[PDB]
Write a protein that binds this ligand. Structure first.
Ligand code: KRS
Lengths: 31, 171
C-alpha cells in the first residue's frame, strides 16, 4: 500500500454544506 | 391548561363563523365613552389628555350597535372586552369578554331559536356531543352531565316565582 496522504478537504469530517431551508409549520387548531 | 385556552379560542372562532354565515358584519365600537351605558355597573374612569376631559371605559357596546342599525347596517356583532369596576369572585372579573349582536326585524322569539342553535351547535362541535360533564363544586365534589340538547327549558320570571314562593304576587 502506498504511503498515506490526508485529503485536501482537511480530513476532519465529511464536507457538510449549508443548504436552503424552510420555516416549519404548525397545524390550524381550528381545522 | 393549554387545552382550556385552545377550547376558549375555538368557542370564539365558532361564534364568529356562526354569525358571519348569517350575514352579520363584525364591527368595533368605542371602549372609551363620555357616557357609559348598556348595562348596570360601576365604571372605570380615566383622564384623556388631548381632549382634557374624563372618559369612562365601556361597560357594554349596546347603544353604539343600535345606532349602527339606525344607520342601516341590519346585522352587526362585536366580540370584545368590557370593563366593570366591581368585585372579583368565581364568576366575575373586572375585564371580561362578551359577544353582542343586533338583528333588525327580529324579536326575542327569534333570538331564542338562534341562541339554542348556536349554543347546542357550539357544544357539539367542540366536545363531540350535547352533554358535557361539570363539577359545580370542583373535583372534590360530585359531577353532573349538563345537557345542551335543544330545545331549552323555558320559565317566566313572575309566574315561576309565584310557584316557588307558594304565594300570589301582584298583577
Ligand atoms: C354581556 C353579559 C350578558 C349576560 C351574561 C354575561 C354577564 C357578565 C356580567 C359580569 C359582570 C362583571 O362585573 C364581571 C364579569 O366577569 C361578568 C361576566 O363574566 O358575566 O355577559
Amino acid at each position: 500500500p502506498m504511503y498515506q496522504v490526508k485529503p485536501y478537504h482537511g480530513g476532519g469530517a465529511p464536507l457538510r454544506v449549508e443548504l436552503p431551508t424552510c420555516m416549519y409549520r404548525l397545524p390550524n387548531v381550528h381545522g | 391548561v393549554r387545552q382550556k385556552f385552545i377550547i376558549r379560542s375555538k368557542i370564539i372562532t365558532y361564534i364568529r363563523s356562526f354569525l358571519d354565515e348569517l350575514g352579520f358584519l363584525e364591527i368595533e365600537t368605542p371602549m372609551m365613552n363620555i357616557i357609559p351605558g348598556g348595562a348596570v355597573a360601576k365604571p372605570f374612569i380615566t383622564y384623556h389628555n388631548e381632549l382634557d376631559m374624563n372618559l369612562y371605559m365601556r361597560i357594554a357596546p349596546e347603544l353604539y350597535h343600535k345606532m349602527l342599525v339606525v344607520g342601516g347596517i341590519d346585522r352587526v356583532y362585536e366580540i370584545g372586552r368590557q370593563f366593570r369596576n366591581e368585585g372579583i369572585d368565581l364568576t366575575h372579573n373586572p375585564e371580561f369578554t362578551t359577544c353582542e349582536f343586533y338583528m333588525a326585524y327580529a324579536d326575542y322569539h327569534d333570538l331564542m331559536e338562534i341562541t339554542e342553535k348556536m349554543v347546542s351547535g357550539m357544544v357539539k362541535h367542540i366536545t363531540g356531543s350535547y352533554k358535557v360533564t361539570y363539577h359545580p363544586d370542583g373535583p372534590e365534589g360530585q359531577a353532573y352531565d349538563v345537557d345542551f340538547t335543544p330545545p331549552f327549558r323555558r320559565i317566566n320570571m313572575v309566574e315561576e316565582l309565584e310557584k316557588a314562593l307558594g304565594m300570589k304576587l301582584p298583577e
